[PDB]
């Protein structure tokens, strides 16, 4: 969540984004790469943002 | 219906509205006021003062009437000040002045001296009739009330000070 | 402009006023004081004036303290204490090294005298706090001077802070207020303050003007 809000996303929506994008990387390795490879974490945030629905707040 | 009517101005060479604030002046001393933020103040065709508000809200109706009456108070205080006629009753009770100050012999073991603050003046017409004049309506009324409360209410002999023409309640007594 | 002097309690005596009334006086030798330092709001944060009092042999003062005295440009003194002043017009009259003396006070003025009250040792509750003690008879078993109860019961299961118990009395800073100055004689630097003054005969006292008047 700390890394996510350095990349301007809540952990809330980053987890949706990875689910929708089909990324099954667990939080062990998500946190560990948020520390070790922050650029890769930013890439993961980018794919999560893309996978998020346009209106994250409207019903599906 | 208070608020939706312009402010008459006899002379008002420098009734100014700068940065959400009003300041009025003229043949007599100055006055200044700040108005609450929902209420605007502007001109009429003849150059009067009009107060406007966002329409139909509980808070803003009250503020709008408030502002209209307040600015009316400034624009009348400059043109002609408020003079409260107070008047003493009770044998042996009297007023007199020492410059801007005055004292009452209203039954105590000492005279009571009221030092006049700024913007307000004192004057006797008699050792019974006196007058508190000034250019701020709130200040004049406040100093007049300060005078009015010097003596406790006396519903038996009415001894004490009054405003003119205003009659206090009595009781039979003994 | 609160004035003050550092002196020694020389003991008490009586004199008689003009009205032929006896007046118990503690005589205090308000020996001459030198200033040695002014406390200023912009450099120390508050207004005060140090006063040095009491002759001491210069060999008897350690060099950290002699350095302070010599930076003040005065002979080292024995006692040193600050008189605290109000927050304005502080040092318009006190100069480091000025010699302020007993007749800074006037006849009939009112003073506050601060001293260290006489030691009383480890004192019991009657002497220290005026406890009534217990009966001398009627069966009272070895509690004649004992405090009695010191708390409640299960509620609270404790004794409150500030409970008056036995302990050391005395050696407390004590100020007595509004003592009359019967007489100050300038010939020998003594003021005759009416009443009692805390501490030993010989102890250091600070005599200030009474702010309660």
């Amino acid at each position: 969540n700390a890394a996510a809000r350095l990349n301007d996303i809540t952990y809330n929506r980053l987890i949706q984004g990875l689910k929708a994008a089909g990324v099954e990387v667990d939080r062990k390795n998500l946190a560990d790469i948020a520390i070790s490879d922050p650029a890769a974490f930013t890439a993961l945030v980018d794919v999560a943002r893309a996978a998020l629905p346009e209106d994250v707040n409207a019903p599906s | 219906r208070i608020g939706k009517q312009p402010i008459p101005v006899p002379a008002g060479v420098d009734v100014t509205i700068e940065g959400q604030s009003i300041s009025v002046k003229g043949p007599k001393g100055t006055l200044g006021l700040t108005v609450a933020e929902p209420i605007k103040v502007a001109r009429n065709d003849d150059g009067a003062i009009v107060v406007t508000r966002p329409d139909d809200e509980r808070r803003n109706r009250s503020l709008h009437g408030l502002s209209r009456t307040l600015v009316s108070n400034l624009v009348t205080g400059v043109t002609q000040g408020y003079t409260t006629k107070m008047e003493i009753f009770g044998v042996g009770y009297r007023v007199q002045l020492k410059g801007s100050n005055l004292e009452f012999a209203l039954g105590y073991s000492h005279p009571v001296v009221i030092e006049a603050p700024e913007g307000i003046t004192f004057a006797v017409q008699a050792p019974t009739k006196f007058t508190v004049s000034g250019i701020d309506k709130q200040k004049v009324g406040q100093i007049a009330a300060n005078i009015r409360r010097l003596r406790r209410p006396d519903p038996y002999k009415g001894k004490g000070v009054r405003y003119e023409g205003e009659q206090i309640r009595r009781k039979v007594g003994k | 402009a609160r004035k003050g002097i550092l002196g020694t309690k020389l003991g008490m005596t009586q004199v008689f006023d003009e009205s032929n009334r006896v007046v118990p006086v503690t005589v205090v030798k308000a020996g001459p004081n030198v200033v040695t330092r002014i406390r200023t709001p912009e450099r120390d944060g508050y207004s005060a004036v140090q006063l040095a009092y009491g002759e001491i042999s210069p060999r008897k003062v350690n060099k950290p303290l002699t350095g302070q005295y010599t930076a003040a440009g005065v002979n080292p003194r024995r006692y040193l204490a600050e008189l605290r002043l109000d927050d304005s017009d502080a040092a318009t009259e006190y100069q480091v090294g000025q010699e302020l003396t007993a007749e800074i006070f006037a006849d009939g003025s009112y003073v506050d005298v601060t001293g260290t009250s006489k030691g009383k040792g480890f004192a019991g509750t009657m002497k220290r706090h005026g406890f009534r003690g217990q009966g001398a008879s009627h069966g009272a078993q070895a509690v004649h001077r004992r405090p009695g109860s010191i708390g409640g019961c299960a509620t609270p299961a404790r004794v409150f802070k500030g409970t008056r118990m036995a302990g050391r009395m005395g050696n407390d800073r004590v100020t007595v207020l509004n003592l009359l100055v019967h007489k100050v004689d300038a010939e020998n630097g003594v003021l005759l303050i009416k009443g009692a003054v805390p501490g030993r005969t010989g102890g250091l006292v600070m005599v200030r003007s009474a702010i309660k008047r």
């Binding site: 809000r5 809330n12 520390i35 | - | 409150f160």
Partner: protein
Amino acid sequence: PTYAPKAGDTTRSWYVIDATDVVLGRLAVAAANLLRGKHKPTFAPNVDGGDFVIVINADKVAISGDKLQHKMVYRHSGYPGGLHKRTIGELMQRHPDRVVEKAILGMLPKNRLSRQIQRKLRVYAGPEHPHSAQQPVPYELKQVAQ
């Protein structure tokens, strides 16, 4: 093995938070988070992460008038009847920095580490702070959109 910060892995920066119109609670949460280091992905609850926080203009923190009149600060000396009442309004006049710092300290975890955490907090009533020897970067309060 999940990363655990070493001694020396903690890099500390300095922030200045302007409290001129910030609601006191918002300010306190932001200061506590920033001064603990919750915002950095290297966070560990057993480590003094977190940066130095200087709050300035503590006198003008946004406290509503009702709180300024009614919210009371309570201090018990430990003596009987030794409960002393102050009001947020009058601590704003006397020690406004104490109001801000008390809010921060209440937000901080109640534990030994927070005693060292709060050592990195400076709160100043005025617009000036003496800690210009560093280059304390200003920090504004932001909310991540969701």
